[PDB]
Amino acid sequence: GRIVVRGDVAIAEAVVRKVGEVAGKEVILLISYRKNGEWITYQRNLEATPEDVERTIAVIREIYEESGGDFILAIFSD
């Protein structure tokens, strides 16, 4: 049940929306991006709420802005 998006911000957003549409079971997100030559990794829980979906979308957009596309989004249905 793994999902990996690398680079495409719009498809990363399309996935995060579908994940949080109807999913009483939360999901664990792995968000990595390169900035200033260093790779940095976050682990963020995604709630099924539409609010936390909006927040996660913004975090993707902000990461895509800093890294200039060099980002990795991995989704763990855990």
Partner 1 sequence: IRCFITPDITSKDCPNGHVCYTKTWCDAFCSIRGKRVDLGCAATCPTVKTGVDIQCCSTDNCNPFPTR
Chain residues that interact with partner 1, rule: CB under 8 A:
28-32, 34, 39-45, 55, 59, 63, 72, 74, 76, 78
Which residue number, 15 or 74, has a Cβ lying nearer to partner 1?
74
Considering beta carbons, is residue 12 or 29 the nearer one to partner 1?
29
Instruction: Rank residues 41 and 50 by Cβ distance to partner 1 and give the closer one.
Output: 41
9-15 long-range contacts (CB < 8 A, ≥24 apart) are: 9/60, 9/61, 9/64, 9/69, 9/71, 12/60, 12/64, 12/71, 12/73, 13/57, 13/60, 13/61, 15/73, 15/75
